[PDB]
Design a protein around this ligand. Structure first.
Ligand SMILES: [Cl-]
Length: 188
């Protein structure tokens, strides 16, 4: 029945205020790299993207639910613009990196990692970061986006009047995507 792309993350509610901020940030970045495309959904990753045999999807989700069940909602800040690539430098991203709340994400990762190991899947990246990805493009666009563009994007965010949309985000759930299936679970 195939091996399914599996990924664990914390959903980010993309409120109108956030999407309307992106309506300013993205065209600004597109003056430097027009081919940037907005992300469709937003979240903070807690696992690598792995592949899992179909037979183990529901057991994996059950194991995750049991470990995530005891964690509480918490607040985080994501208002620092970041340019990053995938490992092979064939995709570039613009994101908002988490500052306050990073430690709480690490605690979630520690429990997700145990479920990964239980299913013979890789644990999280060695030097972890958490970020809301806003937009991406093909190729390595760091030279066009780092420097002047990055500083201008940060100035737009800094000028967003400390809006709670980025400053004090209240997490509510953990979600596992496996193929075209989405399995949610609440934080307390
Ligand atoms: Cl372009």
């Amino acid at each position: 029945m195939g091996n399914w792309a599996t990924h664990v993350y914390v959903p980010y509610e993309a409120k109108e205020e956030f999407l309307d901020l992106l309506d300013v940030l993205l065209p600004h970045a597109q003056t430097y790299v027009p081919r940037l495309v907005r992300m469709k959904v937003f979240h903070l990753s807690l696992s690598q993207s792995v592949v899992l045999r179909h037979h183990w999807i529901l057991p994996f989700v059950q194991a995750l639910k049991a470990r995530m069940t005891s964690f509480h909602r918490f607040f985080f800040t994501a208002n620092q613009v970041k340019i990053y690539t995938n490992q092979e430098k064939t995709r570039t991203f613009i994101g908002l990196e988490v500052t306050s709340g990073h430690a709480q994400f690490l605690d979630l990762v520690s429990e997700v990692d145990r479920v990964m190991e239980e299913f013979n899947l890789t644990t999280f990246y060695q030097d972890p970061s958490f970020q809301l990805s806003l937009a991406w493009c093909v190729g390595d666009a760091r030279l066009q986006l780092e420097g002047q563009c990055l500083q201008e994007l940060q100035a737009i965010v800094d000028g967003f009047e400390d809006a709670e949309v980025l400053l004090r985000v209240h997490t509510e759930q953990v979600r596992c995507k496996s193929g075209n299936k989405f399995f949610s679970m609440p934080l307390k």
